[PDB]
Amino acid sequence: KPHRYRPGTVALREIRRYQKSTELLIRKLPFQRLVREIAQDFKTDLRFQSSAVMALQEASEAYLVALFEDTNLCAIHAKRVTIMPKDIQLARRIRGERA
Template sequence: MVPGVKALQEIRHLQRTTELLIPRIAFQRVVRDVTDKAYMRGPRNNWMQVALKRCVGIAGHEMCIFPSRDPLSEFRFQEAAEVYLTCMFEDCNLAAIHARRVTIMPKDMHLVRRLRGESTMMT
């Protein structure tokens, strides 16, 4: 079998599906952990507050990260996060291809975020 055929088949399959890829419970745990840390005082957690505000903006409303945890809001938030990440990785892949590489690197992510006008600083 030619190298990469299985990977390409998996990519095509995932591109055709619409279900969420991140397990719901694991996603909720990460969101809860990030929100708990984001609301702690201090400059170290500033990037979390910015990320949280950006996700709220993507979803279009305040959702499951706040006291009312309604399942539809949780679904919308997870869907918005997965769409954002998918688009980010697609653009990072294009940046890597432009640099004549097949592997994305942190510098690709920094470039994409800078071109989008997003902050690249994590603190």
């Protein structure tokens, strides 16, 4: 009587749902707290425009989505469908960001 789907179908459904949407996936306030925490180690008592934190979030989510794109290509290349930190490290290494 209780209905349950296979894993692949809800996974692909979420892939479609979030590749159609445009909204920011990281929540606004914990990202803002992360930004203030990282900023704290450069100068005390820093202030931020709201559009500055929104710009940080737009670029950060776009960067991680391109990163997961390359990570998925690394996984698929290695005959897997599950991404691994191996795949993230390979992606960042080929992109030249390992520093």
